[PDB]
Amino acid sequence: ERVVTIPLRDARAEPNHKRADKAMILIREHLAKHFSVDEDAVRLDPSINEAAWARGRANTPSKIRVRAARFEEEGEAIVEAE
Amino acid sequence: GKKSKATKKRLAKLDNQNSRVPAWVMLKTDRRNHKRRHWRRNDTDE
Amino acid sequence: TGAGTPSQGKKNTTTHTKCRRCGEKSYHTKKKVCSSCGFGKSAKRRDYEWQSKAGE
Amino acid sequence: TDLSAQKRLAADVLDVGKNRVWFNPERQGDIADAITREDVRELVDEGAIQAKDKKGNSRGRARERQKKRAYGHQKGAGSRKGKAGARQNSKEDWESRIRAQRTKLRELRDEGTLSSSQYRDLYDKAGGGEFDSVADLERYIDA
Amino acid sequence: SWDVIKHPHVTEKAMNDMDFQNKLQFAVDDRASKGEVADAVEEQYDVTVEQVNTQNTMDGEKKAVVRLSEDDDAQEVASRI
RNA sequence: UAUGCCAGCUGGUGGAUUGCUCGGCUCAGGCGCUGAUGAAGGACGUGCCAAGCUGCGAUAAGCCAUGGGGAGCC
RNA sequence: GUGGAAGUCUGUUAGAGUUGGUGUCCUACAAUACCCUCUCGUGAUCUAUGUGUAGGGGUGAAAGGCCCAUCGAGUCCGGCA
RNA sequence: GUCGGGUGAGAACCCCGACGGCCUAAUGGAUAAGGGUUCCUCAGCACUGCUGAUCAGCUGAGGGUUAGCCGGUCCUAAGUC
RNA sequence: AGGGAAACGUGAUUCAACCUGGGGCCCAUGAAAAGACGAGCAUAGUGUCCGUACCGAGAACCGACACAGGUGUCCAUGGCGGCGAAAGCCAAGGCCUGUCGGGAGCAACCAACGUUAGGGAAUUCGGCAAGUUAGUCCCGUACCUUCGGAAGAAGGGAUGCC
RNA sequence: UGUCCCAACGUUGGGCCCGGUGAACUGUACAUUCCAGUGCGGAGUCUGGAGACACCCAGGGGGAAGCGAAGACCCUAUGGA
Ligand SMILES: [Cl-]
Ligand SMILES: [Cl-]
Ligand SMILES: [Mg+2]
Ligand SMILES: [Mg+2]
Ligand SMILES: [Mg+2]
Ligand SMILES: [Mg+2]
Ligand SMILES: [Mg+2]
Ligand SMILES: [Mg+2]
Ligand SMILES: [Mg+2]
Ligand SMILES: [Mg+2]
Ligand SMILES: [Mg+2]
Ligand SMILES: [Mg+2]
Ligand SMILES: [Mg+2]
Ligand SMILES: [Mg+2]
Ligand code: NA
Ligand code: NA
Ligand code: NA
Ligand code: NA
Ligand code: NA
Ligand code: NA
Ligand code: NA
Ligand code: NA
Ligand code: NA
Ligand code: NA
Ligand code: NA
Ligand code: NA
Ligand SMILES: [Sr+2]
Ligand SMILES: [Sr+2]
Ligand SMILES: [Sr+2]
Ligand SMILES: [Sr+2]
Ligand SMILES: [Sr+2]
Ligand SMILES: [Sr+2]
Ligand SMILES: [Sr+2]
Ligand SMILES: [Sr+2]
Ligand SMILES: [Sr+2]
Ligand SMILES: [Sr+2]
Ligand SMILES: [Sr+2]
Ligand SMILES: [Sr+2]
Ligand SMILES: [Sr+2]
Ligand SMILES: [Sr+2]
Ligand SMILES: [Sr+2]
Ligand SMILES: [Sr+2]
Ligand SMILES: [Sr+2]
Ligand SMILES: [Sr+2]
Ligand SMILES: [Sr+2]
Ligand SMILES: [Sr+2]
Ligand SMILES: [Sr+2]
Ligand SMILES: [Sr+2]
Ligand SMILES: [Sr+2]
Ligand SMILES: [Sr+2]
Ligand SMILES: [Sr+2]
Ligand SMILES: [Sr+2]
Ligand SMILES: [Sr+2]
Ligand SMILES: [Sr+2]
Ligand SMILES: [Sr+2]
């Protein structure tokens, strides 16, 4: 378990009206990588969803501090806002 | 629309004819309802 | 307005209906005349020699 | 589990739009067994099924504007969109004025201040649009 | 000569009408009137008919909803057939 | 030696071919009117389960009589 | 000043229509469609249903227009191989 | 649309919640014509569905339309027999 | 009575519906019939027959289709806005089915579209396309004219908030 | 005033790669062509040379006198209207 700061500047690569969506993806990929786990095993707590969609589908925050934990036999992660 | 009593009887009959060939008729004849109609795909008379 | 597809949408009038006399859906409910058997027009049944080849 | 039918019954029993009925997430199983309307009312009392509140537009910002305007503000040239006669109907305004002038003249007469003949002269002049307002009429009466 | 009563119409909705409203439901000849349905029912089960509502069904038949008097008991009537 | 060409082998696909015929086509002989005593035709019903065909008509794949027939039938 | 006329004006009110883009489409969403622009919008107005006029005949403020995707003579079958 | 969750052998698109959105003469409510059971329930996914499908206007089986006072029914219109 | 968890209001303005009047127009004159009223009251009995589901449309209708087309009526008084049944935003209500998704800062090229220095129609058959102007108030307004008009001519100024 | 000088950068949807779904047009045969010539005088296929290792992706369309339609022009028919 640790606190990490995820940069979401790469969402700008996707069309503007769909940034929120790409954000939620970048977040899952970042945790999967930095916690050495499969993306399928990463669980994003709704708190994170709401943070990214706060300004609608086109206005994503440039970064987001997220608190994630790693455990269990198969290896999974649980993440949330902070 | 407004259906008369007679129109209604005919519509009902058509609905009944729209059933399947009973399973036993299958065994007995040892192996289709050629008149199977659909309300949308088809058009009834009148 | 085209005579084709767009003009087909206006068609919701009932004309030809099941005929009391012959059972065909040819009784014109506006004319009250069957185009198939002649009901409403003649006591005799509608018939014509041109409904078949001349020598048959 | 599929609760769309239950949503329809709930909207009816709660007398609200389907979009406002709320089903407790932790009780999908019980709501799913709800077959009858009675089963629905039962769950309603249990609070497992509730009706979200409907909104009403706030009129606060409108009320402030109404005040400023009733006080004569926020109606400068830059705030008008309609033609003058559209902002105030002229025939309608004349009806207001002429009636007020005739009521005035009618009161002065029964009161004794005006003789039926002085009243006539003024009444006919009012009808000819001689006075801009009641005050204008009074000012004239005072010679 | 066609008969008035064809057979009891037995369905969930029919039973409710029987347990809760003292009503019996019948499939009847569609040429029969409400009055002819009342008479026939009284003569067949020796009961007193109070009201009869009819409906020409999408099965090509006529359904009748016969309410008996408080003197009779639908549940018990239908239960003897 | 990949992509691939030609012929064949095993297996498909397809339904030709051969064989078969409850259907046709044509000829010949016999026969020949029905209906208000409501015909022909149609509609809707009618079966334990019954959608189609056939039959039948609220007595609804059937009722009665006489003769035939026969240990099966629905 | 009053009054409120008008085959009157503005108007994507409803509603009717369609100047240009020679835009989009052109094995289409569509055998006549889509978008913007554009015209009419109290009248010779628009519109629903009912009803009448039938083929060398209708109907036509006339374009040989229209009479069920068909018209300088409809459609079907027959004449007919 | 997205995040969680539900059901299921199987879930991007079947259901719940949250967050995010779309429609305001309509993408809402009642209806005429026309359609004809498409309505409701249960069980299903070979068929139909611009992908998938546990879903459905699809398949199987049942069920559903209750009137003295709402229509028809009555009257007559252009006009028809 | 009913309904509501509860309270279970009182006044006012503007007033669709509905009611009732006044005026004007016609080389145009705006149905008929059944029926009803006229013509009281009690109690009782009778009131049969047919329709009744559902869709009513970017999937239930017509268009071969779950077709961006076509298809009548009433909801024309929900809030802000403003002249407004206009735009834009928002309720009630409906929907995420104008139903395939995943991925590449996602190249060329195409469809829609934003911004372009200086020049300013040189482009082109042609200013085609795009743009310029714009609402409201004040000032002011030519030729011509059938005296109606031309006219919003043109041109000039103003516009928020407190 | 990006119509133009003279084009640039950006936005959204496609285009490209991946999963699933999955047509049509067209097809005498052969076919890697190019330059000349020849030929019914407008040849990928004949002749002479030149060039040419096979396969695949993307592209804009030079050629196949490309595909689509038994030329709507013209003439001819002891044709039609
Ligand atoms: Cl009705
Ligand atoms: Cl008055
Ligand atoms: Mg059924
Ligand atoms: Mg289900
Ligand atoms: Mg005036
Ligand atoms: Mg009834
Ligand atoms: Mg008409
Ligand atoms: Mg669709
Ligand atoms: Mg520039
Ligand atoms: Mg030039
Ligand atoms: Mg222009
Ligand atoms: Mg030719
Ligand atoms: Mg010629
Ligand atoms: Mg000639
Ligand atoms: Na149909
Ligand atoms: Na029955
Ligand atoms: Na004979
Ligand atoms: Na059968
Ligand atoms: Na005057
Ligand atoms: Na145009
Ligand atoms: Na002719
Ligand atoms: Na308003
Ligand atoms: Na889908
Ligand atoms: Na430009
Ligand atoms: Na080419
Ligand atoms: Na000709
Ligand atoms: Sr259809
Ligand atoms: Sr026209
Ligand atoms: Sr159209
Ligand atoms: Sr019509
Ligand atoms: Sr006749
Ligand atoms: Sr004859
Ligand atoms: Sr049934
Ligand atoms: Sr006008
Ligand atoms: Sr106008
Ligand atoms: Sr043009
Ligand atoms: Sr344009
Ligand atoms: Sr075209
Ligand atoms: Sr007006
Ligand atoms: Sr035509
Ligand atoms: Sr012929
Ligand atoms: Sr399967
Ligand atoms: Sr349904
Ligand atoms: Sr008033
Ligand atoms: Sr209803
Ligand atoms: Sr509706
Ligand atoms: Sr539509
Ligand atoms: Sr809402
Ligand atoms: Sr789908
Ligand atoms: Sr800028
Ligand atoms: Sr020029
Ligand atoms: Sr020039
Ligand atoms: Sr100015
Ligand atoms: Sr050679
Ligand atoms: Sr290409």
UniProtKB/Swiss-Prot annotation, chain A:
This protein's UniProt keywords: Acetylation, Ribonucleoprotein, Ribosomal protein, RNA-binding, rRNA-binding
Entry keyword Metal-binding: no
InterPro entries attached to this UniProt entry: Ribosomal_eL31, Ribosomal_eL31_CS, Ribosomal_eL31_dom_sf
Gene Ontology molecular function: any one: rRNA binding
Domain of life: Archaea
PROSITE patterns: RIBOSOMAL_L31E
Keyword RNA-binding attributed: yes
Gene Ontology terms: cellular component: cytosolic large ribosomal subunit
GO biological process: cytoplasmic translation
NCBIfam families per UniProt: PRK01192.1-1 (NF002258)
Functional summary from the UniProt entry: Binds to the 23S rRNA. Located at the polypeptide exit tunnel on the outside of the subunit.
Subunit structure: Part of the 50S ribosomal subunit.
Similarity annotation: Belongs to the eukaryotic ribosomal protein eL31 family.
The protein's name in its UniProt record: Large ribosomal subunit protein eL31
Organism annotation: Haloarcula marismortui (strain ATCC 43049 / DSM 3752 / JCM 8966 / VKM B-1809)
UniProtKB/Swiss-Prot annotation, chain B:
The organism's place on the tree of life at top rank: Archaea
SUPFAM superfamilies: Ribosomal protein L39e
Keywords: Ribonucleoprotein, Ribosomal protein, RNA-binding, rRNA-binding
UniProt feature coiled coil, ranges: none
GO cellular component term, pick one: ribonucleoprotein complex
Gene Ontology molecular function terms on file: rRNA binding; structural constituent of ribosome
PROSITE patterns the UniProt entry points to: RIBOSOMAL_L39E
An example Gene Ontology biological process: translation
Pfam families linked to this entry: Ribosomal_L39 (PF00832)
Summary of subunit composition and partner proteins: Part of the 50S ribosomal subunit. Interacts weakly with protein L23.
Entry-linked HAMAP family: Ribosomal_eL39
Family to which this protein belongs: Belongs to the eukaryotic ribosomal protein eL39 family.
Role according to the record: Binds to the 23S rRNA. Forms part of the polypeptide exit tunnel.
Stated name of the protein: Large ribosomal subunit protein eL39
Gene: rpl39e
From Swiss-Prot, chain C:
Cofactor(s) required for function per UniProt: Zn(2+)
Binding positions (Zn(2+)): C19, C22, C34, C37
Cofactor remark: Binds 1 zinc ion per subunit.
Pfam families: Ribosomal_L37e
Superkingdom as given in the UniProt entry: Archaea
One GO-annotated biological process of the protein: translation
Renumbered residue ranges of the record's region Disordered: 1-25
UniProt subunit comment: Part of the 50S ribosomal subunit. Interacts weakly with protein L4.
Family: Belongs to the eukaryotic ribosomal protein eL37 family.
Record-given protein name: Large ribosomal subunit protein eL37
Stretches that traverse the bilayer: none
Function: Binds to the 23S rRNA.
Primary gene name: rpl37e
Record's keyword terms, sorted: Metal-binding, Ribonucleoprotein, Ribosomal protein, RNA-binding, rRNA-binding, Zinc, Zinc-finger
GO molecular function: rRNA binding; structural constituent of ribosome; zinc ion binding
Cellular component terms per the entry's GO annotation: cytosolic large ribosomal subunit
Biased composition annotated in UniProt, kind: Polar residues: 1-16
Curated annotation (Swiss-Prot), chain E:
One Gene Ontology cellular component: ribonucleoprotein complex
Keyword Methyltransferase found: no
SS bond list: none
Coiled coil: none
InterPro entries registered for this protein in UniProt: Nucleotide-bd_a/b_plait_sf (IPR012677), Ribosomal_uL23 (IPR019985), Ribosomal_uL23-like (IPR013025), Ribosomal_uL23/eL15/eS24_sf (IPR012678), Ribosomal_uL23_CS (IPR001014)
Gene3D superfamilies: 3.30.70.330
Keywords: Ribonucleoprotein, Ribosomal protein, RNA-binding, rRNA-binding
Pfam families: Ribosomal_L23 (PF00276)
Single GO MF descriptor: structural constituent of ribosome
One GO BP annotation of this record: translation
PANTHER family: 60S RIBOSOMAL PROTEIN L23A (PTHR11620)
Family annotation (NCBIfam families): PRK14548.1, uL23_arch
Complexes and interactors: Part of the 50S ribosomal subunit. Interacts with protein L29 and weakly with protein L39e.
Function: Binds to a specific region on the 23S rRNA. Located at the polypeptide exit tunnel on the outside of the subunit.
Family: Belongs to the universal ribosomal protein uL23 family.
Protein name in UniProt: Large ribosomal subunit protein uL23
Organism expressing this protein natively: Haloarcula marismortui (strain ATCC 43049 / DSM 3752 / JCM 8966 / VKM B-1809)
UniProt lineage: Archaea, Methanobacteriati, Methanobacteriota, Stenosarchaea group, Halobacteria
